[PDB]
């Protein structure tokens, strides 16, 4: 009774846990009441319960500090009871842990414990561990002596004492600064997928040894360097408690013949002795590269030795081997066969939301100034991975430190806690760090859920509805397609004048569906054609499968046909090297992978008709030039973020710009903004974009789509009937 499963928390507050409202009524406690949690080894913790709209009804969400105090782990079950008679205390004695306060001296109360305790009304129990962050350090404390017992609530008049030597950490008590799940920002979908694969056989070994179903034995993590491949492997081992053994290419390859094979074998023997255990092999491509890429005796033997050790996992019960590589095809294909490393997870590159989470994680200990905007940084840090955002935060910290250290001139063996605690890192220091940082993944494929929504697209009301039917219905209502014997379309081609929203349509539907958007642009299709590297199309479609559900958008589908002469062409036909590989991959792709293919062309009359056959881009949507009511919507969307003056008549502009495309209306919007900026800057040597700025913009803006080109699209649309 009252036994709930321990889950992860969103609220990092050490004195708070979250419970769903229905459990507040079953436990007869009010929002914010004080409750006790019953853990393991006859231990308990006291905390405040708040409600939210995200906690599962049957789970309790608590952070790492509370779980360690209860000596429980994620997936365990604890009992919850109210304690409405909790009283306040007068005296609490708190001491730091010896393993966390080092190199730093000062008044620990004024820096750490005072803002933590004062007027916080935290429930505190004797023996609790809690973490206070500040001064770019993470310092954990233990409560050793209180006047009331066993617990109390801190009052504004409660006196906090701290005298005596630091406390030696217990051998069964893990440090709160160890890697856990709350240290990982983006790639939450991959972390959840991995947890499902590994936590069950590691926490419940009695399950698998007693059933005919075999566990996963090997998981290959791949993605660019610095994306958290090792961070996840460590977080999993530390959160489940499995013995963690670290392997890396350089450590094994630096050894002589007869030593590298022996050390690799020992690693597997040690994991078995300490099972359940996780063996993490970083830089796997340095140990067992694709066979075609190596001929040395040492490299061939270590490939064979790893393959036999992976096969030995049939007897080495409860040992899971994880590996990190940059590409799934850089290693000996034998490793990826049934067994061995037969599970794979694509970590990828954090998106704008994940980058913000990473910046927030690596600034937890940093004091930030009020002008710091980490969301603005996350949007500017395009092409960065977590390793680069961590370096960015470090560089921003050092720039702030130098500015103060050269002024205070305090040189000693330790640092004053007050000096660091009052040091705030400003936005100028983060911007400076951004200029110094250099993205390690600048040219990698960008796969993310687009921020474009339907509100950003003016007009096209009927296309918006049609795309929902093409993309959502096959997966929202699959039973109707089977009932009526319907074969869902695999993709749609957009055609029509340039600058009418073809790209936004593909992004907006990917966004609403929460699917990954993969953008292939003309220059990329031309690069493959010109360089005779059309084989790379297979990797594009394979990435779409890896990132599924996703929408794979091929822009400028005619880019090659135009490069071949377009209106006249060359001596050949419509088919070319790149489109043929696209056709092949589409034919081999099943609708069960939830990958939807969208194309776009500005010249449908020169698209290889093969792409329009059933099974390919059989659906065709015409995107016309916007009409009057749509052009108004487009102007409002493009100006949604601009400080447009109330005197600007957007309906009048839409009436005049009769032949303009959406892209042409944007040029007017941006040109008027440029004029407003010019005047604003001059006034300092203005608060809004005035009618005069839009009127002057109209002096230069012209329609980019002529009537000759409009008829070309109408004739094609008429041909389609």
């Amino acid at each position: 009774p009252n036994r709930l499963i321990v889950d992860e928390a969103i609220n990092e507050d050490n004195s708070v846990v979250s419970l769903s409202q229905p459990k507040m009524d079953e436990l007869q406690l009010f929002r914010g009441d004080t409750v006790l949690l019953k853990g393991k080894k006859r231990r308990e913790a006291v905390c405040i319960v708040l409600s939210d709209d995200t906690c599962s009804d049957e789970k309790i969400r608590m952070n790492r500090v509370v779980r360690n105090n209860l000596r429980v782990r994620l997936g365990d079950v604890i009992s919850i009871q109210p304690c409405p008679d909790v009283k306040y205390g007068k005296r609490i004695h708190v001491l730091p842990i010896d393993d966390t306060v080092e190199g730093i001296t000062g008044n620990l109360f004024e820096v750490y414990l005072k803002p933590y305790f004062l007027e916080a009304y935290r429930p505190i129990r004797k023996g609790d561990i809690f973490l206070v962050r500040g001064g770019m350090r993470a310092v954990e404390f233990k409560v050793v002596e209180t006047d009331p017992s066993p617990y109390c609530i801190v009052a504004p008049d409660t006196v906090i004492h701290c005298e005596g030597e630091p406390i030696k950490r217990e051998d069964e008590e893990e440090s709160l600064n160890e890697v856990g799940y709350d240290d990982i920002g983006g790639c939450r979908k991959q972390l959840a997928q991995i947890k499902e694969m590994v936590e069950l056989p590691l926490r419940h070994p009695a399950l698998f040894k007693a059933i005919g179903v075999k566990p996963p034995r090997g998981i290959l993590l791949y993605g660019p360097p610095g994306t958290g491949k090792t961070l996840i492997a460590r977080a999993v081992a530390n959160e489940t408690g499995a013995f963690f053994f670290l392997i890396n290419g350089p450590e094994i390859m630096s050894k002589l013949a007869g030593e590298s094979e022996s050390n690799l074998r020992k690693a597997f023997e040690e994991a078995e002795k300490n099972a359940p255990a996780i063996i993490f092999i970083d830089e796997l491509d340095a140990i067992a590269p694709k066979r075609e890429k190596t001929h040395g005796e040492v490299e061939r033997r270590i490939v064979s030795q790893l393959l036999t050790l992976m096969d030995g996992l049939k007897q080495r019960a409860h040992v899971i081997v994880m590996a990190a590589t940059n590409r799934p095809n850089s290693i000996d294909p034998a490793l990826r066969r049934f067994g061995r490393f037969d599970r794979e997870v694509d970590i990828g590159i954090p998106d704008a939301t994940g980058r913000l989470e990473i910046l927030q994680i690596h600034t937890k200990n940093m004091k930030l100034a009020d002008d710091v905007d980490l969301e603005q940084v996350a949007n500017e840090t395009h092409g960065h991975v977590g390793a680069d955002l961590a370096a960015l935060c470090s560089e921003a910290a050092l720039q702030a430190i130098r500015k103060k250290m050269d002024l205070i001139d305090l040189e000693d063996e330790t640092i004053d806690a007050e000096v660091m605690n009052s040091l705030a890192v400003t936005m100028d220091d983060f911007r400076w760090a951004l200029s110094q940082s250099n993205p390690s993944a600048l040219r990698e494929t960008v796969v993310e859920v687009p921020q474009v929504t339907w509100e950003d697209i003016g007009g096209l009301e009927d296309v918006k509805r049609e795309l929902q039917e093409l993309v959502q219905y096959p997966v929202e209502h699959p039973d109707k397609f089977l009932k009526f014997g319907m074969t869902p379309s695999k993709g749609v081609l957009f055609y029509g004048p340039p600058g009418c929203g073809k790209t936004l349509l593909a992004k907006a539907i990917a966004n609403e569906c929460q699917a990954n958007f993969i953008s292939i642009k003309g220059p990329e299709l031309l690069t493959m054609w010109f360089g005779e590297s059309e084989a790379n199309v297979r990797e594009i479609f394979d990435k779409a499968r890896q990132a599924a559900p996703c929408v794979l958008f091929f822009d400028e589908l005619d880019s090659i046909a135009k490069a071949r002469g377009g209106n006249i062409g060359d001596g050949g036909g419509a088919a070319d090297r790149v489109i043929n590989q696209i056709l092949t991959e589409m034919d081999g792709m099943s609708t069960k992978k939830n990958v939807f293919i969208i194309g776009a062309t500005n010249r449908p009359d020169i698209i290889d008709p093969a792409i329009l056959r059933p099974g390919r881009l059989d659906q065709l949507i015409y995107i016309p030039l916007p009409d009057e009511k749509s052009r108004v919507a487009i102007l409002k969307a493009n100006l949604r973020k601009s400080p447009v003056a109330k005197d600007v008549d957007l309906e009048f502009l839409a009436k005049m710009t009769n032949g303009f495309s959406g892209a042409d209306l944007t040029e007017i919007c941006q040109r008027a903004c440029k004029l407003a900026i010019r005047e604003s800057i001059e006034s300092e040597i203005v608060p809004e974009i005035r009618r005069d700025h839009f009127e002057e913009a109209m002096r230069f803006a012209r329609r980019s789509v002529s009537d000759n080109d409009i008829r070309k699209y109408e004739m094609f649309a008429q041909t389609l009937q």
């Binding site: 009010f30 708040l50 009304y121």
Partner: peptide
């Protein structure tokens, strides 16, 4: 009772500061 109600207000205020 009253000591739990004071902790309730403090926990709710910190949650709102983190959510905003």
């Amino acid at each position: 009772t009253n000591e739990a109600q004071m902790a309730a207000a403090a926990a709710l205020a910190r949650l709102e500061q983190k959510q905003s």
